[PDB]
Amino acid sequence: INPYLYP
Amino acid sequence: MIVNVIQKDRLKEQKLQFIRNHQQAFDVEPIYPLPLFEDFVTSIEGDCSLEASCKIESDKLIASRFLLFFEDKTQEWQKYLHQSLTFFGLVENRVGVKINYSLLQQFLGSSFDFSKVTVLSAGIDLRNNLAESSLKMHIRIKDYPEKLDKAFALSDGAADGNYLKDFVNLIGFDFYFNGKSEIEIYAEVQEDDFFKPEINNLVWQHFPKTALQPLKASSLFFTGLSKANNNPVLYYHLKNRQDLTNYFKLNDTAQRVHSFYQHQDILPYMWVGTAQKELEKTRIENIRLYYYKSFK
Ligand SMILES: CC(C)=CCSP(=O)(O)OP(=O)(O)O
Numbered sequence A: 001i002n003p004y005l006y007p
Numbered sequence B: 001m002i003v004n005v006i007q008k009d010r011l012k013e014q015k016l017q018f019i020r021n022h023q024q025a026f027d028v029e030p031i032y033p034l035p036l037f038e039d040f041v042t043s044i045e046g047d048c049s050l051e052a053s054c055k056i057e058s059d060k061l062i063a064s065r066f067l068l069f070f071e072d073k074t075q076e077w078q079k080y081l082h083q084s085l086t087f088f089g090l091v092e093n094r095v096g097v098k099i100n101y102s103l104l105q106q107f108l109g110s111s112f113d114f115s116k117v118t119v120l121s122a123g124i125d126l127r128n129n130l131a132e133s134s135l136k137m138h139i140r141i142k143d144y145p146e147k148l149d150k151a152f153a154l155s156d157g158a159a160d161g162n163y164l165k166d167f168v169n170l171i172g173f174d175f176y177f178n179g180k181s182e183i184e185i186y187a188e189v190q191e192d193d194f195f196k197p198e199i200n201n202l203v204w205q206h207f208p209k210t211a212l213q214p215l216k217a218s219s220l221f222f223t224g225l226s227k228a229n230n231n232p233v234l235y236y237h238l239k240n241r242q243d244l245t246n247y248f249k250l251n252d253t254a255q256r257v258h259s260f261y262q263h264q265d266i267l268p269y270m271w272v273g274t275a276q277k278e279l280e281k282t283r284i285e286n287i288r289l290y291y292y293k294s295f296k
């Protein structure tokens, strides 16, 4: 989803 | 092939542009050694994101904060680690400082499984006082309990409990120009789990009610744990950066940052970081605001 959490 | 040449140069400039927009808005002069970070982002050729950030301390605006996320879907993590460290070495040479790498070295250890990495970042948090400047790295790990134990051990008791291993994937490294270094552990809750009773049991009931309000507008929640932190830092991933003012009582300085960003050409989401006791207040005095652009 966002740069700190892959999806 | 000519298409690749145009696009390469285009991405280089778009990245520098994002950086310059942020610096030029909040600092008339660039903080040294920002041009070295600028060279580093330029040297990276694959797909990346950039984070530009402000830390607000009452009326003090700290704005020379930038991070690059390696997002080239090749998953070449070791290559990106080596590029980041090469950049860090260059900073050591030009600035005339020695970085303390021990916490990263111990975390990597001898047997690091790079296939378990899902995020890698490299960046800077620069001050006019060189000693207070830092280089930054984050590593996100998936299904690597052996490395989680190591990072928890390296935390030196800033790791609140070993029950928090359930919540931790992102590991943060700070490298101060004075040879001091810190590790941070980020305990997360994803949106799909916000309303689960286990989450209320283990997380939510330990926070005051004001800390729970911004979850309504959030897709993700971190608590940042480090002995470098005066207080646990709560992080909220707002789906839309426009909701900032709805959920956070901003001071003048932070409103200025918010205002500048409302109409920049950037990603819709933002991150917000603040200590728990700020949310109890009538106006937040200390806040961290993070903005993002991707370059495909
Ligand atoms: C924005 C998020 C969720 C994580 C990065 S925050 P950080 O701990 O790297 O930044 P600070 O320099 O501590 O404010």
Ligand SMILES: [Mg+2]
Binding pocket: B125, B134, B174
């Ligand atoms: Mg910092």
Ligand SMILES: [Mg+2]
Binding pocket: B172, B184, B224, B226
């Ligand atoms: Mg931190």
